[PDB]
Design a protein around this ligand. Structure first.
Ligand SMILES: OC[C@@H]1N[C@H](CO)[C@@H](O)[C@@H]1O
Ligand SMILES: OC[C@@H]1N[C@H](CO)[C@@H](O)[C@@H]1O
Ligand SMILES: OC[C@@H]1N[C@H](CO)[C@@H](O)[C@@H]1O
Ligand SMILES: OC[C@@H]1N[C@H](CO)[C@@H](O)[C@@H]1O
Ligand SMILES: [Mn+2]
Ligand SMILES: [Mn+2]
Ligand SMILES: [Mn+2]
Ligand SMILES: [Mn+2]
Ligand SMILES: [Mn+2]
Ligand SMILES: [Mn+2]
Ligand SMILES: [Mn+2]
Ligand SMILES: [Mn+2]
Lengths: 393, 393, 393, 393
């Protein structure tokens, strides 16, 4: 398994550039020059790079400095061929965002945060990005009385609709994607899961260009099924981007390499991305982006090893998932379990409610105890899946 | 604290009628006659009763028997004055529903399940219920390959839209409410949280009459903030009913008496229900329904004690929450923390995106480091809330 | 793969005999005869069968029925050659155990539970069991004021020490193993994890013959690392028996097939059980017991598929764990990461605390900045395990 | 309320000195001078102050700086009268501890970490501390193949036993206390719960002077009951010190003010610390230490508000716990539930296992169906605690 640009593997600058600072200790690695991240990622088979405005351009950069940096960064892109499919804003690091950007209690701070976002949209637009991601990191609270919850959602809506409205106004070919996270750094973050993100989108004036950016580990932080979460996003056609990584339980956001967390779950995510739905339906065609952090214990050879580990894991899973669905044995198991029967409408063509209620075969004389006898054989289907995954079939 | 019908305390028949059978042991209490539950609940101050079709009418009841039972149950209602505000269907107990009702893999079972629901709507309509609740208990899976996830959501939609369509067709003054649960009895249940329920509703043809029925313990089972979840439902105006209980962590569905789980959270739920949003907004005006189970260790005096404990806890919380918001000290704390400033729109009247981006006060010359100096004083606000709760103020 | 008796694969009667009654519904399968059970497991490659007293002998059974049942059961053992390596007592099913066996608040129930255990030691001894397991499923509470916590542990000690003294007094060749569980069916169960069980054993009079019986799923319900927990039990030489199964997350006890939960973790559990420690040390030599439940959606063909599935999963993982450790690249990766260096004592032979302190090379003139540069290469070592597990190397 | 030194309220320098740098952003407050800290806590009613070696003495400090810093610090102690009851070592901040102190894979780091601890015992002894706390924050791993689990525990034992032998050898009047944590910053930390710490202590050569230092929040991160866990440490006579704080759920370590997490649990923790056991037994007599962090959204007025808040919360709950137990209705409710009956031994004075077995009244002729009817009235007893806690009785 050798990744090629065709594979569409994208990495964030903050991923491989992650310094090692955690809540209990300082950085273990020296800062990484962005030019060098580009060159290194290009040599590994990456297709593109993504960043946060402050990952590239310092908060206090002068204009001459801003120009220099972009010149260097575009030079690296031009020399290597890397694309920049997504750009994002840092609304969490500076002490000004301690209560949030868009949902800060302070109105002057909310204004500043939306201005930071609008300028960042211009940047994204000039970099040629297709997606613009919003992670509301500091949006939430530690205490239930800190906020007016209907007012926090109005202020969130205001911000996203101003940003969406501006995109349309300028005619940029950009979509907004929201990234849910249940907690950390706040005790409770607003729009904590894929479901809440989807629900909020439907209340927006400019919801047509607003979608989701689910992250593996974040749904697993609420103990949810990541594959089910992204299936719901797909089904609603709001899967605009994805962040792949690993999480080993309900605890702090680990951001491990993709497949280094829940393996079986990783396996079914890849099947969903590659094979789509058994009965057909929408398919995700965007970048396969890794939002992970090289463990702080590892030094620079470890940083490039971990980058590579993401792409290897994905390709190894993909091979197995393709083999899995191609197996005649598996296709037979699927049939028996009623995976294909779930695809059939419950009602007959032009059958009404009333028609079903008096159909005696369906209710009045339906043999409930004979129907309960079906052996779904879901265990055998799971065993087959795991045998493909272990490459023993 | 003495509950009166005015309070709108509703109880399910299965709550006080819960027998004590769990996964590791048999029933510890004898079955409770429904007539006796009515009479007992009436004497305690209940406003009404709710039930599942099979809580009242056995699965295999003959027509003569069905008639008898309803006659007895309506007699009890007439004698005591209890209303029946909500009715629900059991799509989980019989062995036929082992893979679900609406999303079973077997099409004949899906047909039977929707027929069971349609007949149950007629029943609800003749009982004078305002709400009809759907809990998809067996809808989900243990294994990721068991289902076609886009097909499971199409089949879920079919069912709910047929039911919604039928309501409109018959002209019943009934609303449908979905109840989310993350897991148990399935490893993963579809529409696992308030957020996912809300998101699914927006894909329905008849979504105008479909809302939510969040249960305290169920959101706490994913480690979410129940108050935030219901605030999102309110804000979207989809809070059609609620099930109040307690949960002491991420573990099996406990269904403890309301306030016997997370107390501080219970306190802020009650404030939200009673006081509404600090800056104004929608208010929940339906029944305050308890979906709990008297612990299996307790015998019949314990059953009526626990019923009473629900209503006492609610009234005690309500007193404290009303006192809390009325306190001048608390109103001052709120002001300082910017609870009222969150209510102000971020943008000025007729201010555009572009207007904000060039306003130099808001970005270019905004003093980020002086703005970061604000002391939100959220700890002091929480301390005041807890002092009201402990009745020390 | 194909299992044989030399593999030491043991199953409980209650596993394959699990009929499907959960808290939300009735049984989906017919009762399994115990003689059928024995013949079927023996045909599958099993080495032994385990049981709870009431799995074989009904609570009500007269002395005549006891003897009839045992005689048929012993014949089947005889005909097949299956051993009975472990025996256990049901102290959780019957309503009398609603507040516990050994720690019930009621003194007369405590005496009855102890008598029940004493009788069961005699049947255990008589069957040839080497281990007697005690799972305190009803020992605990829902509310914190329910028990005197010091008195609960004294009563727990008293039961265990009487059971252990009785073995010693009779000279039975039996050991007691305690099975930890954090919750379910109690809100909080006493001795909730491997650590707490281990700690308790040290306060016993007859501690020398009391060890543990860890269960995969149970430590995973507190979000703990199962391999770390069994490592500590081994290390302390207290790993007397084991229950292997799967669990996906912190939720209700699932008891899935071993390998159908956390796959990566299952792999490293197999590596510690089969292979032991990289620097050498203790080894677990007992039965590989499976405590699982065949999913209720499946029929009897699924029950027998699932028993096979436990054994295949373990053998597949065993193969992979062997290949992984045998790999020269892995051994070299292990060396780089300091795996073997951890095995060297910190102090030199004869060195004292005072010698280490004043050694200027270990403290005063130690270059902490230089030592921090070490690449431990833990991501790379984890990637090599995963590739071995995917059968990619 | 108002706290006084007789209350034994102790705070760590790192608590009020916590500047706000989290994993997603920089400090929001200015550094706190340690002399300012002492004066301010002494003005608040505190009895003592605790610290980590690097909280006072920088890692880099020369011998001259060490002495200057200590002299100013000792003066402040002198001027205020605050004691220094506990001292601890930072083995987690500096990059050299990226794989642990005592269990680092690197032998030279292990020696450096032990020397660092030995030097710190000398400063502890010299300050008048009675307790020396050890929190192994970097001891553990992200991946299961990273460590030899038996070698990790031997190295952990070796460090602790050298530290304990050195105290004994010098005749310092000091005890070692281990602080358990399940994860963060490591994916899995060794000795993750109270049980595991307790179990480990029993494998030590110098176990007699080694106990535990439970922290509220940490046991709650594994979803465990904190009162049950401290009860077992007490019971074993290993509760040497304690850290009190708040945590809302299984997520990142929050370290909220004590009482701002799980309120009901906080109440029952206060009842065990102040009041002890209902049937009598052990009592914890040490300092009531608060290990928390003032929320980063608040300024210095919030820091001092939060220190006050810890002390008020504890005193408010203490009042309520006293009134609760003193209440004659509660005492009578306790009696009904068997709280005092649990305190009676199961066996009669002189009775043997063989006597209990053959007593026909305890087994053979016991009416299990009659005994099962007992109403334990645990819901009613929990309701009485809650009403006392709400200051309603
Ligand atoms: O890939 C997207 C980025 N990932 C970061 C953390 O999850 C966010 O700031 C943002 O959504
Ligand atoms: O109050 C509603 C009822 N509660 C039960 C369990 O939560 C469901 O069947 C249904 O939603
Ligand atoms: O194999 C062990 C047995 N398994 C059951 C479930 O955990 C227990 O009763 C007992 O410990
Ligand atoms: O008060 C105890 C201290 N608290 C810190 C955080 O848990 C530890 O380093 C140490 O155990
Ligand atoms: Mn993340
Ligand atoms: Mn991300
Ligand atoms: Mn529930
Ligand atoms: Mn409910
Ligand atoms: Mn189990
Ligand atoms: Mn078990
Ligand atoms: Mn902590
Ligand atoms: Mn601590």
């Amino acid at each position: 398994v050798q990744p090629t640009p065709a594979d569409h593997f994208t990495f964030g600058l903050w991923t491989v550039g992650w310094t090692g600072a955690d809540p209990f200790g300082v950085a273990t690695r020296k800062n990484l020059d962005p030019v060098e991240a580009v060159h290194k990622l290009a040599e590994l088979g990456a297709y593109g790079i993504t960043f946060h405005d402050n990952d590239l351009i310092p908060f206090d950069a002068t204009e001459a400095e801003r120009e220099k940096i972009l010149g260097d960064f575009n030079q690296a892109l031009k020399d290597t061929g890397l694309k920049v499919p997504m750009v994002t804003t840092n609304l969490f690091s500076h002490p000004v965002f301690k209560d949030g950007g868009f949902t800060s209690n302070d109105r002057s701070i909310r204004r500043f945060a939306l201005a930071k976002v609008l300028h960042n949209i211009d940047l994204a637009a000039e970099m040629g990005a297709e997606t613009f991601v919003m992670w509301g990191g500091r949006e939430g609270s530690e205490y239930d009385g800190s906020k007016d919850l209907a007012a926090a959602l109005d202020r969130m809506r205001e911000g996203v609709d101003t940003a969406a409205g501006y995109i349309k106004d300028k005619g940029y070919n950009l979509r907004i994607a929201l990234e849910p996270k249940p907690n950390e750094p706040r005790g409770d973050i607003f729009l904590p899961t894929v479901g809440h993100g989807l629900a909020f989108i439907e209340q927006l004036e400019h919801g047509d260009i607003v979608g989701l950016n689910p992250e593996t580990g974040h749904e697993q932080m609420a103990g949810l099924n990541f594959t089910h979460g992204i299936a719901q996003a797909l089904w609603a056609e709001k899967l605009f981007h994805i962040d792949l990584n690993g999480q080993r339980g309900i605890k702090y956001d680990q951001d491990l390499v993709f497949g280094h967390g829940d393996l079986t779950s990783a396996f079914f995510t890849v099947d969903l991305l590659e094979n789509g739905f058994p009965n057909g339906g929408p398919k995700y065609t965007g970048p396969r982006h890794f939002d992970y952090k090289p463990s702080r214990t590892d030094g620079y050879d470890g940083v490039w090893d971990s980058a590579k580990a993401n792409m290897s894991m994905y390709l190894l899973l993909k091979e197995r998932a393709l083999a899995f669905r191609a197996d005649p044995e598996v296709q037979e198991a699927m049939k028996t379990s009623g995976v294909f029967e779930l695809g059939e409408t419950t009602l007959n063509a032009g059958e009404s409610a009333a028609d079903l209620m008096n159909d005696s075969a369906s209710f009045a004389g339906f043999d409930a105890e004979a129907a309960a006898e079906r052996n779904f054989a879901f265990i055998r289907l799971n065993q087959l899946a795991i045998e493909h995954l272990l490459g023993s079939r």
